[PDB]
Design a protein around this nucleic acid. Structure first.
Ligand SMILES: Nc1ccn([C@H]2C[C@H](O)[C@@H](COP(=O)(O)OP(=O)(O)OP(=O)(O)O)O2)c(=O)n1
Ligand code: SF4
Ligand SMILES: [Ca+2]
Ligand SMILES: [Ca+2]
Ligand SMILES: [Ca+2]
Ligand SMILES: [Ca+2]
Ligand SMILES: [Ca+2]
Lengths: 469, 959, 111
DNA sequence: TTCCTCCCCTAC
DNA sequence: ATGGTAGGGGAGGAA
């Protein structure tokens, strides 16, 4: 009986305060240096996509060798012909065990090729191509490139782990047919340091991704408004559970429109509506907007932050200098530092492309050891991406990048306590621990298909979800 | 190395008990040191390989070259003592060379004078070169003996010695010869002159020469050796043999009709790290490398040294390099031990093949099948570089190492040298794959067996030699001689065939197409046209022939006799040549592979140029045996057959005869008639075209046959010899889109026009939305004007010519390239250029694309739009929409920031795709990729997109 | 007080419960009560009701299906959200004047 | 500004 | 030495 439950829910507290309260102050690390930040000037697009691979190999060789000196040691006694030694990937012969390091490179038939599209005059088509691998054909080959050589791999391990291109992990196998390996063991790089975070007066963070605003209104705008109202505490008891949420983090895909048809009309009304929402919510919460893949920002992965011009005049007071604490506008994969808890966030394209590698396409039979459907395998992919020190393995090859020279920001230097990936279809979390260091992998879902916004605690790191409908 | 050398000879081998049976691939005149056989010492050496794989050098000894002259008209000519005194006088005059003078009864090939045979004098000579001097003397009149040949005479049967032996014995090129058991003698190891395993000598009367039909049609296990070299040239200067060494030499020796080669090598100038699957003979000095390569060839004994540009670049470079390095024993690697290989530059000019200068090298005993020549003859392509032909036929664009980086790779380390070695291995395995796909050996073997010329003539001489060989064989069969006729320096031209006036327009009615099968050959075979059937009015009055029963007057007025009187030989030659085309077309009929059906279609389309060249032979004033009374008498009979078809179908399929519509012949070119039956149905238009073909073929004499070729449901008749339509053969699905002549199938038009015209025609004819077609046209005109078409689509190609009067753009460009780089295109090479912008004349304004992509010079866009793209598009869209519209077609900060940000978001997604496809292509993920495969689509594009993205980001920096 | 002609009926744009806070300066924990008593007694004409529902697991859903879901427990509060007597859907939002907030002041001055 | 040669290429 | 002729269309030069 709908009316009587309303009558019961008559709450009539009636003060709640005049007396506006204050959120608990959790401040990002002041802008010092963001490895993912490139001004549009000084971008020298002349170089090629080979300094990236050279730097990855050059930096991962030490990280793999520091582990390979102990495991597979110079006196290791594998069944026979012990390990003979290191080598240069091509300088290998015989059936003796051996181990080298090389940047794996997959070769699938469904990986879209631009030369074929040009020669077929079909360049510029929709790029649906849901998955790359060829499961029902087995034609996928997993090579192991190095400085000089290209050794194909075959065996049982390449059916256990993902083996995504661009990653550099030392392999150990037996040369079978003078061209291939028979993989026997895989060495992941050395463990990477973290920062220490002290145990102590509170904190939370509201994570949200995939707003996807547009002219069509299938509850999207209404869900966004309900979101800001719930973040205002106007939907529940006022304080002590919403008074401390501290900061919001929009994690990409905020404004979705049809580039193919609209001709830039709705891309303005969506931004005006978004700016309305920001002006309504900013006096109450600080906000950090992070560009997605479908947003007014670059398509190269180190996407630079949103421009001040995209936003309505209303927010100009926020964009004034010395107001980064209110609005942030950070680059796409960003390394926040909220009260010491180093949280690394992505828009979620890297894991999407990794799954494009591993997951099959429309097959037209069910594997348990493999055939990642989509439940936990995405968290396993993020686990690997935290093992494989770089956070975008297939960077130059399938999710395009600025052709860096002498440095790659994607390869990690220190692990973050939290690793938030965005726009994932499913919400999940795992407290992964590798090499004595543990991190927390949160996978925020889309706010369009679902309604979840995650509230991550910054003292227990036990994130909880709240579903909006 | 136990796989190189051929199968060892059987131990129990002796001249008796055995029958050496082998396939002769080559034959050349030579002198045989030893006892003269049948008073002659010269021999013809038939190199070959037997069925088991053993070499042979059969010396065919005992053949004496002869000269035919008519018996002089006198009383003493029948006195034997007079003939003996005559041969005595000749020996006095011509170095004791004339052997004898047989009296044989022959007839001439010119005209039907009657069934009586004149007496001729067969003058044998000891060495075959004497016949030239004897013929000159006979023709001028220097002989003075009883006033016999004092005036001058006409000699007969002027053909080379090798072909004379091959004609008399009955040996077609690439056929089988059986030296009978015990009739042949073996050359003793002391007097051997070759490297072959079996080196024998037989009398020409003894050997059995099988025809290439039946049990003897197979092919022996030939050994094809492909190869390639790479030279380390000084910076900026093309490799010159005198100063720039050869550093590597690949090798892919293989057996004909095999899946994979059984040898791979790379002879490198320095140490080279091992490659899997290919030995690596790494030498220390260039002299040792060249000598070991020679020893390698001698040990392998390949039969067919194929390559790509080996005739012009590789082998001449090797020979001049060995000469410059004082390697004196290198240039002897033919099947004969002590014959030096030398370069003899020869020029071949023809209307259908164009002038091109070749540097022939005489590798004795071994064929040569440089694939560049094979493709330049068989296929019309925009360019013939290795990259482009590989991309066309094999379908693969692969990296092409930079030229200047070769020196660095060589002077680096063993790893870099392995990189060079794998490049050479790819370059050398390419021609062999091309040869296996294109079926060069099989097609050329069929050609040399059908016509009769040796395999070496197929790629070094035109069609006249094939007609000459077939003619000589048939005359020999029928006791006839060919009179040596001095060339009638020139003429103007004779009459061609009629091209019916077109009823131009765009037709939505189905357009049947009725054409004759092998028109001119069928006319020749039908009305008995031939040399030995020619006649004149006087002869008819003398012999008292009857009309339409013993002779026919052709529509050109010339007389010929029916088959009752004589059976001309050109009917028989054509019968064989168009009965082999039937059995070559009975193969692609039964062929599934789509790429095999455009090679089996290049074999039926080469036996139809070889049967239409029998006509061209009679029609060629320059060149022996020109008879402009059989050739200007088929053009008539070809002009009274369309004039009769266009008058029969147009007046049978009419309303009076009980049909629905009046038929209309809207076009027709030399045999065809694009009849428009007047019905909209297609299964009924085809059903009527097939009935018309039958009825009309009923009107002509066998074998003339008019068959319903195709149909065009939509038809676009632009002009005379230019049109387009859909190609329907069955009434349920169209096969393809034909474009007969339009600027899209031309090769002197940029690829932009081809693409635009193909898409426009596709829309208009298949999709039937004219408005969508015009919208795409306007979209292109914006691209050209805003510099958004890639140079790959603006490259024009023309064939350089030997001499010019009115300067041409590509000619001035070729001169300028020669002056800039030190080497430019040669006569006969297609030159590629794009038209840059400027003020001076057009010919002064044309540049090599790689110069445009290295200096950023502004491609003239107004010129392209106006000259290249305008007139073709206007011509093909005017029939649909009328001429007027067609000519008309060619005559706040925030929103601003959304632009130049959704433009960079489109350029930085193409930049990465292109410059990572280059990495996926070269395979080299970890080091620099320097490519120069300028026939690659992405070439010229990656640099454009880079230069655009840099500028767009520089511009976006400001906001 | 309750100026319910231009607040509900002639308010023809769908009236959000936050408009009460922004106009009458009332609090949320009182604006819900005002809307409550209004639809309880004051109503005289057709008016569509839209109610939010917050659960123990913090789920916020509004469609409320008019029949039930596990409400038999787990319901903390159930506040009457906006009314839409125009009955179709789709309000529209804009810049709103602040300085009337009893929810929370963010942390910082705007400078 | 209208013919009238070269010049390239194709169609039969 | 070298198969044939018919014909379109582009560039340019002279009258
Ligand atoms: N390279 C050529 C092509 C054709 N013709 C002449 C002789 C042909 O008899 C006549 C017909 O031209 P086609 O292109 O139609 O060739 P055919 O019709 O003779 O062969 P087919 O009918 O089998 O297609 O043109 C020629 O002389 N030289
Ligand atoms: S430019 Fe790129 S695509 Fe073209 S051949 Fe070179 S590597 Fe291949
Ligand atoms: Ca080469
Ligand atoms: Ca025909
Ligand atoms: Ca035809
Ligand atoms: Ca036909
Ligand atoms: Ca003309």
């Amino acid at each position: 009986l709908t009316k009587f439950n309303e009558d019961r829910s008559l709450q009539d507290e009636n003060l709640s305060q005049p007396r506006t309260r204050v959120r608990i102050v959790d401040d990002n690390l002041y802008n010092k240096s963001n490895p993912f930040q490139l001004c549009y000037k000084k971008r020298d697009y002349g170089s090629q996509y080979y300094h990236i691979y050279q730097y990855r190999l050059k930096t991962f060789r030490e990280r793999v060798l520091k582990e390979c000196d102990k495991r597979w040691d110079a006196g290791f006694t594998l069944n026979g012909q012990l390990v003979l030694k290191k080598d240069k990937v091509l300088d290998i012969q015989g059936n003796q065990p051996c181990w080298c390091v090389g940047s794996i490179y997959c070769e699938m038939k469904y990986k879209p090729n631009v030369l074929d599209e040009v020669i077929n005059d079909t360049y510029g088509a929709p790029d649906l191509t849901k998955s790359y691998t060829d499961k029902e054909g087995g034609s996928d080959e997993i090579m192991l490139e190095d400085e000089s050589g290209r050794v194909l791999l075959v065996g049982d391990f390449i059916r256990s782990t993902p083996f995504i291109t661009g990653v550099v992990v030392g392999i150990l196998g037996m040369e079978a047919e003078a061209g291939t390996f028979q993989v026997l063991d895989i060495c992941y790089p050395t463990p990477l340091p973290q920062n220490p975070f002290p145990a102590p007066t509170r904190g939370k963070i509201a994570l949200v991704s995939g707003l996807n605003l547009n002219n069509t209104s299938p509850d999207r705008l209404l869900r966004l408004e309900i979101l800001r109202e719930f973040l205002m505490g106007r939907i529940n008891n006022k304080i002590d559970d919403i008074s401390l949420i501290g900061r919001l983090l929009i994690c990409g895909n905020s404004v979705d429109f049809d580039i193919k048809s609209v001709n830039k009309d709705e891309l303005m009304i969506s931004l005006t509506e978004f700016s309305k929402f920001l002006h309504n919510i900013l006096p109450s919460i600080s906000v950090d907007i992070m560009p997605g893949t479908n947003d007014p920002s670059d398509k190269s992965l180190p996407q630079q932050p949103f421009h001040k011009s995209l936003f309505d005049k209303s927010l100009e007071s926020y964009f004034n200098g010395s107001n980064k604490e209110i609005l942030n506008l950070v680059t796409n994969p960003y390394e926040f530092s909220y009260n010491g808890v180093d949280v690394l966030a992505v828009s979620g394209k890297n894991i999407n492309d990794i799954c494009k590698y591993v997951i099959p396409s429309n097959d037209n039979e069910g594997e348990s050891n493999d055939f990642k459907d989509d439940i936990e395998h995405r968290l396993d992919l993020m686990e690997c991406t935290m093992k494989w020190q770089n956070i975008a393995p297939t960077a130059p090859d399938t999710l395009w990048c600025y052709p860096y020279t002498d440095k790659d920001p994607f390869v990690l230097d220190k692990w973050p306590h939290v690793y938030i990936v965005a726009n994932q279809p499913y919400f999940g979390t795992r407290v992964v621990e590798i090499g004595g260091k543990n991190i927390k992998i949160i996978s925020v879902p889309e706010f369009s298909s679902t309604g979840m916004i995650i509230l991550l605690d910054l003292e227990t790191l036990e994130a909880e979800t709240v579903k909006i409908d | 190395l136990s796989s190189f050398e051929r199968k060892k000879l059987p131990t129990d081998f002796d001249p008796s008990l055995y029958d050496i049976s082998f396939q002769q691939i080559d034959a050349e005149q030579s002198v045989l040191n030893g006892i003269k056989d049948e008073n002659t010492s010269t021999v013809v050496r038939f190199f070959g390989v037997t069925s088991e794989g053993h070499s042979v050098l059969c010396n065919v000894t005992g053949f004496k070259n002869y000269l035919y002259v008519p018996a002089p008209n006198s009383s003493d000519a029948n006195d034997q003592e007079q003939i003996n005194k005559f041969v005595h006088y000749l020996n006095e005059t011509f170095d004791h060379a004339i052997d004898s003078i047989e009296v044989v009864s022959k007839q001439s090939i010119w005209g039907y004078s009657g069934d009586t045979k004149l007496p001729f004098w067969k003058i044998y000579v000891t060495y075959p070169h004497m016949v030239n001097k004897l013929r000159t003397a006979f023709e001028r009149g220097h002989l003075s003996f009883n006033s016999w040949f004092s005036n001058g005479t006409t000699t007969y049967d002027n053909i080379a010695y090798t072909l004379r032996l091959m004609v008399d014995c009955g040996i077609v090129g690439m056929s089988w010869i059986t030296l009978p058991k015990g009739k042949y003698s073996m050359i003793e190891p002391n007097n051997r002159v070759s490297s072959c395993q079996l080196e024998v000598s037989i009398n020409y009367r003894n050997l059995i020469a099988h025809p290439a039909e039946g049990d003897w049609s197979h092919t022996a296990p030939l050994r094809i050796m492909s190869f390639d070299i790479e030279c380390a040239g000084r910076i900026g200067v093309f490799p010159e043999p005198e100063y720039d060494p050869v550093i590597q030499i690949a090798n892919v020796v293989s057996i004909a009709g095999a899946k994979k080669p059984f040898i791979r090598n790379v002879f490198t100038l320095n140490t080279c790290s091992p490659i899997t699957g290919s030995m690596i003979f790494s030498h220390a000095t260039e002299e040792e490398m060249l000598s070991n390569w020679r020893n390698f060839i001698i040990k392998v004994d390949p039969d067919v040294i194929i390559g790509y540009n080996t005739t012009n670049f590789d082998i001449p470079y090797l020979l001049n390099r060995a000469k410059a390095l004082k390697v004196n024993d290198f240039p002897y690697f033919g099947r004969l031990k002590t014959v030096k290989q030398e370069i003899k530059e020869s020029v071949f000019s023809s209307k259908a093949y164009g002038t091109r200068e070749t540097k022939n090298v005489n590798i004795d005993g071994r064929l040569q099948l440089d694939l560049l020549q094979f493709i330049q003859r068989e296929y019309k392509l925009r360019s013939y570089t290795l990259n482009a032909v590989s991309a066309h036929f094999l379908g693969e664009q692969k990296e092409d190492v930079h030229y200047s980086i070769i020196s660095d790779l060589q002077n680096g380390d063993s790893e870099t040298r392995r990189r060079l070695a794998v490049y050479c291995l790819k370059d050398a395995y390419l021609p062999l794959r091309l040869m296996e796909k294109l079926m060069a050996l099989v097609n050329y073997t069929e050609m040399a067996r059908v016509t009769g010329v040796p395999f070496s003539y197929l790629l070094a001489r035109g069609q006249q030699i094939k007609v000459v060989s077939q003619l000589f064989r048939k005359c020999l069969e029928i006791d006839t001689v060919i009179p040596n006729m001095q060339s009638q320096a020139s003429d103007d031209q004779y009459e061609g065939a009629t091209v019916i006036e077109p009823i131009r327009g765009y037709y939505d009615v189905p357009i049947a197409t009725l054409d004759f099968n092998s028109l001119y050959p069928s006319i020749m075979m039908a009305h008995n046209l031939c040399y030995t059937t020619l006649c004149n009015k006087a002869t008819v009055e003398r012999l008292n022939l009857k009309i339409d029963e013993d002779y026919v007057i052709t529509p050109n007025g010339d007389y010929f006799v029916t088959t009752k009187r004589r059976r001309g030989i050109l009917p028989i030659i054509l019968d064989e040549l168009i009965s082999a085309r039937k059995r070559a077309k009975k193969d692609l009929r039964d062929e599934k592979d789509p790429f095999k059906r455009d090679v089996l279609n290049g074999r039926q389309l080469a036996l139809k140029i070889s049967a239409n060249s029998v006509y061209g032979f009679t029609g060629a004033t320059v060149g022996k045996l020109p008879c402009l009374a059989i050739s200007s008498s088929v053009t008539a009979y070809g002009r009274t057959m369309i004039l009769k078809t266009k008058t029969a179908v147009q007046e049978k399929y009419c309303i009076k005869n009980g049909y629905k519509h009046d038929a209309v012949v809207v076009y027709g070119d030399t045999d065809s008639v694009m009849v428009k039956f007047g019905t909209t149905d297609l299964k009924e238009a085809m059903d009527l075209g097939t009935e018309a073909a039958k009825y009309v073929s009923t009107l002509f004499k066998h074998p003339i046959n008019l068959e319903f070729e195709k149909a065009y449901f939509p038809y676009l008749l632009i002009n005379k010899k230019r049109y387009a339509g859909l190609f329907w053969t069955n009434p349920d699905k169209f096969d393809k889109l034909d474009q007969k002549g339009l600027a899209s199938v031309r090769r002197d038009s940029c690829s932009l026009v081809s693409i635009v015209m193909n898409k426009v025609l596709k829309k208009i004819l298949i999709e039937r939305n004219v408005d969508g077609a015009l919208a795409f046209v306007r979209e292109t005109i914006n691209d050209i004007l805003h510099n958004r078409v890639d140079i790959s689509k603006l490259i024009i190609s023309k064939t350089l010519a030997p001499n010019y009067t009115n300067p041409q753009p590509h000619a001035v460009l070729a001169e300028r390239m020669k002056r800039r780089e030190g080497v430019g295109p040669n006569v006969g090479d297609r030159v590629d250029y794009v038209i840059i912008g400027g003020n001076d004349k057009l010919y002064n304004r044309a540049e090599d694309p790689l110069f445009v992509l290295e200096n950023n010079i502004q491609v003239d866009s107004r010129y392209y739009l106006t000259n290249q793209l305008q007139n073709p598009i206007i011509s093909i869209v005017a029939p649909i929409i009328g001429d007027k519209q067609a000519n008309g077609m060619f005559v706040r900060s925030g929103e601003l920031y959304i632009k130049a940000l959704y433009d960079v978001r489109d350029l930085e997604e193409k930049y990465s795709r292109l410059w990572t496809q280059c990495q996926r292509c070269a395979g080299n993920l970890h080091s620099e990729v320097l490519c120069s495969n300028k026939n690659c689509d992405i070439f010229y594009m990656r640099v454009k997109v880079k230069k655009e993205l840099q500028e767009k980001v520089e511009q976006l920096s400001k906001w | 007080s309750y100026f319910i002609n231009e607040k509900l009926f002639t308010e023809v744009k769908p009236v959000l419960f936050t408009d009460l806070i922004h106009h009458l300066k009332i609090g949320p924990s009182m604006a819900k009560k005002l809307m409550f008593d209004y639809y309880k007694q004051t109503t005289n004409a057709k008016y569509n009701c839209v109610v939010i529902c917050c659960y123990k697991d913090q789920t916020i859903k509004i469609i409320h299906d008019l029949s039930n879901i596990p409400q038999q427990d787990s319901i903390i509060d159930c506040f009457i959200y906006a009314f839409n007597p125009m009955d179709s859907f789709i309000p529209y939002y804009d810049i709103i004047d602040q300085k009337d907030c009893l929810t929370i002041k963010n942390s910082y001055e705007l400078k």
